[PDB]
């Protein structure tokens, strides 16, 4: 049986003798931007999923990108993907014209 070739462990903050392990090893940031790209005024907006250090909850924010702390709890990774898909569909259906998605990492 060759399971260990493919098994992987995730990084965690090792524990001293007073506190337990805390696995999210660094803040995980993901940003998405949407824009018509036309000469039209479209006020390109941004979405930002976040998973902070030592906290396995997810969060989001939808402030409009430039040309404050209104976070909301998003459940988990699958929920985050659902929210991203739904927001993309809504933006496209509201634009009534071409719209593009610019994905970024950390």
Curated annotation (Swiss-Prot):
Cell location: Nucleus
Tissue: Highly expressed in testis, moderately in brain and pituitary gland. Expressed in several fetal tissues, including lung, brain, thymus and kidney. Expression is down-regulated in malignant prostate tissues.
Quaternary structure and partners: Interacts with MAPK14. Interacts with ATG9A.
Function of the molecule: Required for MAP kinase p38 (MAPK11, MAPK12, MAPK13 and/or MAPK14) activation during gastrulation. Required for down-regulation of E-cadherin during gastrulation by regulating E-cadherin protein level downstream from NCK-interacting kinase (NIK) and independently of the regulation of transcription by FGF signaling and Snail. Required for starvation-induced ATG9A trafficking during autophagy.
Family membership: Belongs to the SPT20 family.
Official protein name in the record: Transcription factor SPT20 homolog
Species this protein is from: Homo sapiens (Human)
Phylogenetic lineage: Eukaryota, Metazoa, Chordata, Craniata, Vertebrata
Residues of the full protein shown: 306 to 428 of 779
